[PDB]
Amino acid sequence: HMALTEQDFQSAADDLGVDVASVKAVTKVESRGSGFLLSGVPKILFERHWMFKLLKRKLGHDPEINDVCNPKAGGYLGGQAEHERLDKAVKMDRDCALQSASWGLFQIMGFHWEALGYASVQAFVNAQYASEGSQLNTFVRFIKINPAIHKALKSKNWAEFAKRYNGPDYKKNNYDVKLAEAYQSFK
C-alpha cells in the first residue's frame, strides 16, 4: 500500500504552515507507524461505547447490548479482528459502526467526519482506504479544525500540544518530552 513519502510530509507541513520536522515529530510520537494491516485494510480500533452512544442517539432509546455495542468501554480483540468487530457493528447500523472506529495512522474517530469536512461518513472511510498520505491529510484537517492545537504546534509548545491532543494525562506517557526529542532528531 502507498506509505508516507517525503512529499506527503512536505505537503502536510505546507498545509499546516509548520516545518517538516514538526510533522515528522508528531507522526513519530502520535501515529501507529503504519496506517494499514497486512490484509491491506486500514488499521482500526472499534470503540463499543461510542457504538452504544451513537446508536442510542439515532434510535432515541438504548440499542441491544453485545460485545460491539456496550456502554462499558473495552473488549478489544486487536489487529485484523477489529475489522470483524466493525463488521458485526455494521450489521446493527453501518453509519454508527463506521463512526465508532478510530482509523488510520493517527487513530481518528470516524464521528469526526463532518467536522473534518468530508461529504459523508463513507467519504471519510474511503480517505482511510486511499493511502497513508490521505490518512495524514485526515490528521491535517483535525489540526486545522482545532486552532488552539494548531497554534501550539506552530509555536513548538509541545506541552500545550500534548495536553490538548493527548489530554490531561499526557504526562503519564511523557508525550511532551517525546515530541521535543523527536523534533530535535528531525531538525
Author numbering: 0 to 186
Quote the authors verbatim.
The structure of the monomodular Pseudomonas aeruginosa bacteriophage JG004 lysin Pae87 is presented and investigated in relation to repurposing its function as an antimicrobial agent. The structure of Pae87 shows that it is a one-domain protein with the typical α/β lysozyme fold.
When Pae87 was crystallized together with the hydrolyzed peptido­glycan sacculi, we expected to see a fragment of it bound to the catalytic cleft. Surprisingly, the peptidoglycan fragment (comprised of linked NAG, MurNAc, l-alanine and d-glut­amic acid units) was bound to α-helices 4, 5 and 7 on the opposite side to the putative catalytic pocket, in the same place in which a polyethylene glycol fragment was modelled in the apo Pae87 structure. Tyr128 probably establishes a CH–π interaction with the l-Ala methyl group. The most important binding residues would be Arg93, Gln121, Asn125 and Tyr128, because they each make more than one bond to the ligand. In the crystal packing, the peptidoglycan fragment contacts a neighbouring protein molecule; this may be the reason why the ligand-bound form crystallized in different conditions and in a different crystal form that diffracted X-rays to higher resolution. Regarding the catalytic activity of Pae87, the disaccharide found in the soluble product bound to the crystallized protein (NAG-MurNAc rather than MurNAc-NAG) already indicates lysozyme activity, as described in the literature for this family. A peptidoglycan fragment was bound to this region of the β-lobe in the Pae87–peptido­glycan crystal structure. From these results, the existence of a cell-wall-binding site within the catalytic domain can be proposed. In the absence of a CWBD, this region may be used as a binding site by Pae87 and the other related lysins that contain it, perhaps performing a function in the endogenous lytic activity.
